[PDB]
Amino acid sequence: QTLHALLRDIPAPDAEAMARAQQHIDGLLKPPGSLGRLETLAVQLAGMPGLNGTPQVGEKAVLVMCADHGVWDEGVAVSPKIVTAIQAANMTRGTTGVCVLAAQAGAKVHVIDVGIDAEPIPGVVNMRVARGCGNIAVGPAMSRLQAEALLLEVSRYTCDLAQRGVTLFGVGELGMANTTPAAAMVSVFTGSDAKEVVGIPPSRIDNKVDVVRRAIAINQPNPRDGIDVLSKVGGFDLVGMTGVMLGAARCGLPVLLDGFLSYSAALAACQIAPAVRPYLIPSHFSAEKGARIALAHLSMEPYLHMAMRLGAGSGAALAMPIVEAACAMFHNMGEL
Amino acid sequence: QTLHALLRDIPAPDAEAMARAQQHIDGLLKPPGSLGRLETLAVQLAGMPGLNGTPQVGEKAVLVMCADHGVWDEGVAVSPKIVTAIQAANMTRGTTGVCVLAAQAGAKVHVIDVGIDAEPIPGVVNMRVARGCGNIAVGPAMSRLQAEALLLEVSRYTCDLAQRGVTLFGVGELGMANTTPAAAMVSVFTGSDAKEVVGIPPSRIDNKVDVVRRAIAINQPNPRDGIDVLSKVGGFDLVGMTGVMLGAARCGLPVLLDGFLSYSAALAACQIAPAVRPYLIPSHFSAEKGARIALAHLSMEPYLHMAMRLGAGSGAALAMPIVEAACAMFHNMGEL
C-alpha cells in the first residue's frame, strides 16, 4: 500500500490552466460553434495536471485487462473458457481489432493477465490474482484484500508509464462471461433492475438475468462501497480497469473508456474516488443494452456511435485521434 | 456538357466485391459485433468501383466551396458580407479549423470560389459563377443553366482528382447567410415546415423563418426536380457541394458529408441522381436544428456526435480516420 494514500493524492483539475485554455480558444478566429465538443475537450485536457498546463498528447497506451470468471459455470457465455487465453495470446501477436486500431492511432497495447485460468502466456504482463475469479452466482468473486492489492498494482503500473512519455491511456478488457459481473455492478451502482442492464434466445437471456439477481442477492454488495461491489460481484478484469482509471487520475492524466464493461469499472472508480471523474473521456456508445443507463449515471455522452460491442479497447483506440484533434486545433488554429 | 451523360454513367455498386468483402470479414477471428459499423463501412467501401474491389484509402481531399448570397440583404446573418472573403483567404494559409483537421487526417484542402462577392483571391480555385447569387427572398438564386454548368464543372474537377491518387473526398462550404438557403432546400425536399428546420434572439429567428417561407412562396421550387430546387432557393456553394457528390459518385468513389449545409446538398444530389446515395458517408451529427430531419430523409446515422456547427468541412476531415480504420481492420486483422 497505500491505497488510502493514492486515493487522497489524486489532484484536483487545475482551474487556472483551464481558464487560460478557454481564453486562448476565445482568442481563436472561428465561426461560433465550429469546434463543438473539441472546445470543451481541449479545456478538460488543459485542467489535467499531468499534461503540464496545455492540451497535448505524447505517447499513448491501451491497457487490455484479461481474466476468466467462475460464473462461466452458470452457462451465461456461449464460448468455451479457453477463448480468453487464445485471445490474450493473439493480442501479443498484434492480430486483434484493438491491436490494429491501436496501430492506427500510434498507440502501444499493453496486454495484462490479471486472472486467466490457463498457463501464463509468454509476452503478456503477469499480474494474475488467481486462475479465474470465484463464481459470483454462489459467493464473492474475490476477497476484499485481493481487490485492493490488484487496484494498487495496476494503478502503479499505469502511472509508471507516464515515465516513458505516455500521456493518454485507453482501457479495455477481455474474458469469457465478463458481461455478467459488469451488468451486476451496473445494477448495483445505478439501482436499475437487472433486466434493464443485462446484455443481450429467450431462455438464455432469462438465465443471464436470473444469474445477475442471484449474485446480488447472495453477495449483498454495498453500492456506497465501490471496492465491496468489485470484490463481491465484479471480476479481476473489472478491478483491473478500475485500477487503470485510478492510476491515470493519480498521474493527473486522461483515460479513454471503451464500452459497457469499462463503464461498469468507471462507475466503481468514481464511487471509490469521485476525483477520478474529470480524467475520464468517453469514446463510443456501446451496443450493449445497459450502455445508456451506465453512461447516464456517469453523465457522459460518447463521441462515437459505432454500434460496437466486445471491442476489448478498440473504441478507446478509435477515439484517440479525437483527443489529438482537440489538441491540434488548440495549438494550430489562427487567432482574431 | 453532358450532365445527362454524367448522371446516367454513375456506376452501380459492385455486388460481387461486396460479397467477397463480407466473406473476408466473416472469415476474421473476432468476437461477435466487435467491428460494429466498421464492418458495414468496409463492405460499403468494397462496393465502390473506384476502390478497385477492396476497402482502401489513398490520397484524401476536402473540397470547400465558397460563395456569397443576396439573401444576406434580408438580415438573416449577423456577420458582415466580407467575412466570406476573409475566411476563404485564411483557408489558403492553412489556419482554419478544417485546415488543421485535414492536416491531422493527411488530407489536402481544395478551396473553391464558386461565387464570392469580392475580388478573386490568389491561391483559391476560381470557378466563380457571379459575385454572390440572387437574393432568394425576391427571386431565384440563379438560372437553371448556371446551376447545370457549375454541377458539371465541379463534378469534373472532383473526378479528375482521382488521377492524382485521391480516393476519399470530404465536402464543406463557407459563405455568409448560407444556412438560410440550406434550410429552404431541406424544407422543400422533406416537406417539413420551415420552423422545424431553420437554424438557430426571438425576432431574429422569426425573420429567418419568414425569409425561408417567402423564398419558397416566390420561387415555387419543384421538390421532384433537384436542379430546380438548387437554382431557385439554393446558392452557388450548395450547387458546388452537390457537384462534388455527383463527381465522386461518377468516379465510383466515397465522399464524406459534413454538417447541415452538406445534408441539404446531399438531399439535392440524391433527388437528381439516386445512384449517388451508396457513395455518401456521414461524418458528424450537426448541432443545427434541422440536422435530424435532413439525416432521416437520407436514412443516415452519423458516426460522430461532436455538437459541431459551421465546420466548413471540419466534420468530414475528422471522420477520415474512421474510414481508414475500417480499411485497416479489413486488411490487418487475423483470421479464424
Curated annotation (Swiss-Prot), chains A, B:
Transmembrane keyword on record: no
Keywords, alphabetical: Cobalamin biosynthesis, Glycosyltransferase, Nucleotide-binding, Transferase
Biological-process GO terms, alphabetical: cobalamin biosynthetic process
EC annotation from Swiss-Prot or TrEMBL: 2.4.2.21
Subunit: Homodimer.
NCBIfam families associated with the record: cobT_DBIPRT, PRK00105.1
This protein's name: Nicotinate-nucleotide--dimethylbenzimidazole phosphoribosyltransferase
